[PDB]
Amino acid sequence: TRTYDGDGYKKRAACLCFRSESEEEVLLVSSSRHPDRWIVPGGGMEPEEEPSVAAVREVCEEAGVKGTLGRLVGIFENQERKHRTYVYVLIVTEVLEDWEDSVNIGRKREWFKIEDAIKVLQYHKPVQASYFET
């Protein structure tokens, strides 16, 4: 069940999944419909689901990683697609081999230096590139 803010924007949560506390390398996943493109893993908050809980759940489903939840980076709108995403830092401590989206839709994952993550997100996901700006 998709959930919405009072202005009709879909509610989402995502994590910047860093390899370590140095926050130098981040895990991106393939687009579901366009597997040659990269995205920041994330998805819809469920009814009454805390944003931090949604963020960690979606990263597990889409990227097959777990770790230590860190700070809220910010809340980011996509005006054209009408969604609003809570973005958290996650420091990855567990990388699991056969995760929900790998099994179900063959979703890929890959580590990027922050500057390269910004580069591959810019064209189709400029708001997700902006998650890294600060």
Ligand SMILES: O=P(O)(O)O[C@H]1[C@@H](OP(=O)(O)O)[C@H](OP(=O)(O)O)[C@@H](OP(=O)(O)OP(=O)(O)O)[C@H](OP(=O)(O)O)[C@H]1OP(=O)(O)O
């Ligand atoms: O363009 P489309 O139809 O292929 O889907 C878009 C997006 O549609 P929008 O742009 O219309 O909002 C989906 O949101 P919806 O509006 O359908 O709910 C979104 O799901 P999401 O919010 O993350 O929600 P969860 O499924 O994770 O909960 C999905 O992410 P994937 O999870 O990766 O499939 C995106 O694909 P892309 O970014 O390419 O991978």
Ligand SMILES: [Cl-]
């Ligand atoms: Cl790192």
Ligand SMILES: [Cl-]
């Ligand atoms: Cl976006």
Ligand SMILES: [F-]
């Ligand atoms: F999802």
Ligand SMILES: [Mg+2]
């Ligand atoms: Mg999802």
Ligand SMILES: [Mg+2]
């Ligand atoms: Mg998603």
Ligand SMILES: [Mg+2]
């Ligand atoms: Mg979901």
